[PDB]
């Protein structure tokens, strides 16, 4: 009755999450042109821009993830901002949609990492500077710690979605519920709910380009 | 805020100070050239 | 009864989680205090950053909130 | 020589003048002393400006006019925004050492 | 090939000129809005659009984008405007230049 | 990257050349400046420099009362009253300097000088530091 | 069979092949972590 | 009864979480008092941050206090 | 009886909430200790900002202890 | 029952967790103000690492929070 | 019995206020470190706002004793 | 029945404990930022020193929640 | 029993109250830290006064413990 | 039975208490990270003074943790 918005969609009993799922592609159109519209032409200053953010801090071998990182932070936000129109499903509220996107990008890094690199990896397991008497269980910690970097990763989106989204919702209900009650306290919980949505907005974008930057972030330490 | 400032002193005399420190801590070889080197001998009027 | 009983209690529970917000946003706005006494002329920089941290104190703060509400008013 | 030739003409805006410069070879003492003797005054000025003889070569000598800032305006210039651990204190320790070494390299000039 | 200099003539950013032209003949000028009324009222009436927090969370965003684009529209607008002239512009120096460089060899 | 300038009012010892690494007493604490140092202004208190060549080994002098400025352009200023060598200093005098100095000051009583003295003291204990 | 190869494949192989290696190894590896979580179920 | 009983505790675990309130204005001022020692001609300007940052700390901390009041002498 | 039972539990609860102020007080005095040393001239208005912030650091605190004092003895 | 009753006190205390997320956001932006007050020419490296530590400290908070929702919805 | 249950369970409570204290001592005598090897010459008026501060740090953590104390082995 | 009840309970205790490495990651990154906004030439020991602290953290917290996982699941 | 079951949730309740000494000595070693590397030539003056710091955490910490193992094995 | 059950309660409690060495080390290795870019020259007794401090933390945290292990598997 609550987290309806998140019940897997369905019409006419044909499963639509693959209708919502392929869309945000399609927003992105794509020309050979060298003067196109305007649409296009902030699209792709912002794809410039983003490029130039993300792939600056890497060498060339880290260069080549280039197109997958930027596709993958396009992809997260236009499906983000897409959440965020009423009684829409927003697929990276799944916990499945993002543990796949987590640990194929994450997996693929360390293994990377350890095709190339072997020593290198194996040892950046271990900060060196650290003096001897507990080097031992200290590599426990960053082992522990490198296998739950794919699912927090997963985890980090799925949540700050999520959660986002039903606080929306309730403050929603809560309007609704005041709008027979008392208006001006109708009126004060309407503009609480707008500087929500504003700061939804925001953390939409700021989630896609956390995920993308954190993949980054283990590509560089792997390549 | 050092303590010789609230006293009144400008920096100059700060380092007049600590620049002769050093220099009557000089070995007597050095310290003669040194010590006219950067003696003062202006007059105010 | 005992379940009345325990939403009360766990809407406590859950509400405390707000100092971390109040503490939270004491220090940005903390910060944006020294930061401008630091350089007078970045204002509007400042206080951009300022309304972003506290924004996203809020966030934390009030995702604890309607946990409380969640768990005491509708589950 | 230059107190004596001005004396007469500008007595009423004058400060304070110093002698027994030019037959020792100047040092930074001299410096240290007339700028002690410059902030000692009293007198904080807006700015000030030294003016003196660049050394060009052998025969020939330019009068030049080197700028002081006070700490005032050193303080309020926008460019010093991107200088770090300033105030007024620090600010002042450096401008009075920096009369003194402007002064010294002017006399040495 | 060229590109024609604009779209297609939108009211209220939701409904083309198309669909007023279209009705006007056969029920006037504000034919379109008394049916667009009509429809409104008979869809909150007979609850087929069930007034929910959906309904006040959607106010919410509609007022943010009306007002983000009647404010930050223009500005964008121009930009991209301007970073086109400025591609085009360089791209013609860039031509200017070359012509020089076969005259003067 | 390093335009460093370490220079007596008498002597030069450095004048654009490039090292990788200095050490300065500032009045508010000793630190360190390398390349692109955030613009730093300060003056400075009796003890030790250690300029880091590039080629990694370090020439240390020791200054008196100077200035330090490290600009946005990587330009780094450090102006001394006295630069020193490490050979060129005594340990026997700047002990018995500081013994004589502390013994005055507890003898000396009025403000101003007391200050001078303390002055005095410091120098010449950052020096009996600095010696070994 | 055709133009799922020409505008589909050609432009991907670079990276389907040599980029995305190590990418299709975790795929592998997520594949079988869905299987294992679906059945203890 | 069971109730009241949950009521009470529920009331002091909400009212824990003053706690941060309290922490968050304690920071807020000793960075007022850092960054005056630091610029001492902003006063206006850093009191006025100071009493907006109080403000949202104070905002949070009576959020976790009129909670404690509403689950015990309301619900 | 569970009443004064749930009491005494809720009262150390509430208690629990002096902690924020005790940290809140030990910043406040450290942050004016680093203020003095910074510039120790305007001490006056340094140790009145420290009272003003130790003083809404108490409010808090004591607003917890009360609310312990309130469902212990009153309540 | 008992078992529900649990779950509520159990997801009440796993959500507390979240203040501690809270408080370092706060931290983070709060340094952010001051590292930008300090050389406002590194703004996009600044924020760089703004962005990285909010998501570690906000990792560990969503952790928290799944946690609860573990425990209430789950389990 | 009871009654004996919840005191104990209070008093645990009730002492977990003394983090707080903890915390605000530590930062005190930090910020006395810091204060001291900023300007070493002001060391007896450091030292006695440090013991001011860790005075009402220590007023606060033994109010939250005593009500250890009070609800223990008194009430 | 009551253990699985209390297993729940003990479970969302455990995991209250990782609000102190949300805090300490938070400190650690905003500590960062503002070292690279004081010498932005030392980059990579900043940075390694950066993990280092994160690694410990993130140990901690780790602890913390595997005791939650031991005691909720396991135990 | 119930009373051996009280004493247990007490002690651990009791124990809790150890975070708070973790933390304070974690700042006052980081700021050592920091004060060692503003001016490190009071070593010795900047660690008396660490040892000093560190001493009274340990006070706390240790007041909290044995409450623990008052509560627990003697009472 | 209940004594069974409270000792898993009590455990998780006294568990709760590694968040504040967890916070502490944060904090340690946060200050150590600002005091090498301050000064790169003393990276030893930096590092030092580092260890010692993470050493009391780790202290304080191995306490409460035995606490846990104390009351849960040997009493």
Known sequence: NLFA????????????????????????????????????????????????????????????????????????????????????????????????????????????????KIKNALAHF?????????????????????????????????????????????????????????????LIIFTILILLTILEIAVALIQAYVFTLLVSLYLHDNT | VAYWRQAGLS?????????????????????????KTSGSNVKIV | ?????????????????????????????????????????????????????????????????MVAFLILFAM | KIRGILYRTHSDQFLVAFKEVGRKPPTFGDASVIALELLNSGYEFDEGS???????????????????????????????????????????????????????????? | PPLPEYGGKVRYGLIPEEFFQFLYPKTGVTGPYVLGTGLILYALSKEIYVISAETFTALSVLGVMVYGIKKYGPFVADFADKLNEQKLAQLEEAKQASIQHIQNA | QMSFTFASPTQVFFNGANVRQVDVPTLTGAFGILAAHVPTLQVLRPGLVVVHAEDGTTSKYF?????????????????????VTLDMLDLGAAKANLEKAQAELVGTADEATRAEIQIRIEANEALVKALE | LQ????????????????????????????????????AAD
């Not at chain 3, 930061?35 to 996203?56: D, T, W």
């Not at chain 4, 309020?76 to 620090?90: E, F, P």
């Not at chain 7, 050609?10 to 869905?34: A, D, H, N, R, S």
Request: charged content about 10%; hydrophobic content about 50%; glycine content about 6%.
């Open chain 1, 5 to 116: 918005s998140f019940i897997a969609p369905t019409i006419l009993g044909l499963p639509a999450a693959v209708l919502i799922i392929l869309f945000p592609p399609l927003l992105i159109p794509t020309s050979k042109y060298l003067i196109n519209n305007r649409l296009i032409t902030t699209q792709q200053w912002l794809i410039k821009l983003t490029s130039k953010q993300m792939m600056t801090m890497h060498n060339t071998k880290g260069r080549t993830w280039s197109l997958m990182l930027v596709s993958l932070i396009i992809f997260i936000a236009t499906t983000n901002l897409l959440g965020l129109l009423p009684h829409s499903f927003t697929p990276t509220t799944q916990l499945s949609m993002n543990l796949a996107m987590a640990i194929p990008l994450w997996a693929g890094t360390v293994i990377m990492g350890f095709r190339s």
């Open chain 1, 126 to 186: 271990l900060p060196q500077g650290t003096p001897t008497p507990l080097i031992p269980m200290l590599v426990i910690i960053e082992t522990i710690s490198l296998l739950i970097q794919p699912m927090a990763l997963a985890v980090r989106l799925t949540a700050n979605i999520t959660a986002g989204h039903l606080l929306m919702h309730l403050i929603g209900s809560a309007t609704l519920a005041m709008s027979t009650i008392n208006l001006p306290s109708t």
């Open chain 2, 11 to 35: 920096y100059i005399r700060y380092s007049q100070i600590c620049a002769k420190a050093v220099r009557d801590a000089l070995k007597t070889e050095f310290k003669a050239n040194a010590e």
């Open chain 3, 1 to 65: 009864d005992i379940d009345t009983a325990a939403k009360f209690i766990g809407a406590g529970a859950a509400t405390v989680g707000v100092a971390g917000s109040g503490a939270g946003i004491g220090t940005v706005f903390g910060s944006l205090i020294i930061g401008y006494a630091r350089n007078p002329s970045l204002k509007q920089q400042l206080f951009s950053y300022a309304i972003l941290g506290f924004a996203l104190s809020e966030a934390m703060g009030l995702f604890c909130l």
């Open chain 4, 50 to 109: 030294i003016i003196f003889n660049k050394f060009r070569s052998v025969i020939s000598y330019k009068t030049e006019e080197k700028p002081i800032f006070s700490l005032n305006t050193v303080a309020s210039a926008d460019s010093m925004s991107i200088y770090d651990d300033i105030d007024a204190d620090v600010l002042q320790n450096y401008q009075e050492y920096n009369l003194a070494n402007i002064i010294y390299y002017s006399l040495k000039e």
């Open chain 6, 63 to 83: 200054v008196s009362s100077g200035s330090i400025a490290v600009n946005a352009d990587s330009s780094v200023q450090l102006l001394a009253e006295e630069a």
């Open chain 7, 3 to 38: 133009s799922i190869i020409k505008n589909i494949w050609i432009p991907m192989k670079p990276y389907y092949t040599k980029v995305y290696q190590e990418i299709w190894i975790g795929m592998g590896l997520m594949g079988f972590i869905v299987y294992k979580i679906r």
